[PDB]
Amino acid sequence: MANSKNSIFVGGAGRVKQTIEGLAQSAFKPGQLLARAAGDAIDVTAKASTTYGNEFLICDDQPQTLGGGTDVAVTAGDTVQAISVLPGQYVLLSFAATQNVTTKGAAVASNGDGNFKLGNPATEQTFAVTEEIINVTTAGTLVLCRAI
Amino acid sequence: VIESRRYSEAGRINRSMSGQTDIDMDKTKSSYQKMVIPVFDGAYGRDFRD
Secondary structure, three states, X not given: OOOXXXXXXXXXXXXXXXXEOXXXXXXXOOOOEEEEOOOXXXXXXXXXXXXXXXXXXXXXXXXXXXXXXXXXXXXXXXXXXXXXXXXXXXXXXXXXXXXEOOOOOOEEEEOOOOXXXXXXXXXXXXXXXXXXXXXEOOOOEEEEEEOO | OOEXXXXXXXXXXXXOOOOOOOOXXXXXXXXXXXXXXXXXXXXXXXXXXX
């Protein structure tokens, strides 16, 4: 595989990431959309797809010295290190099933389950823009996208 | 008048486990409080023949 996908923040050689720490509530996989809640705990979003004003908050992969990878789920009830995405960076998202990415530059909406999808940019908040031409069939595949 | 300065306290901190959570800055304001310096004096004296 010439496109190795073992780091969820691949967005330039001079751009550092912005980290939002917090507590866990469930066991999600790295690369999914999050939403902070009451107390100081983070979990999956579970908001509607047609709701604006959400912050671009994805789950960073955990450190190598804590048993973390791009497919290892997080341990519940602990400190999950996340990423707030600035506009103009590339990040590996995680799409849903049965959608093909044909052109580099389509709009990336947010599904209600914590994954992303190609939606019409007239009724949902556009988070990012596609940057890789692949076709996915299993829910949970990593697709490169630019956050602008 | 001897006006002296009295600055404030400052600082917002933030805790983390990874340590990279956008360290955040502050400074100090100021205000002044003044006093006054008057002059006291006194004298004494006798005559010549005494």
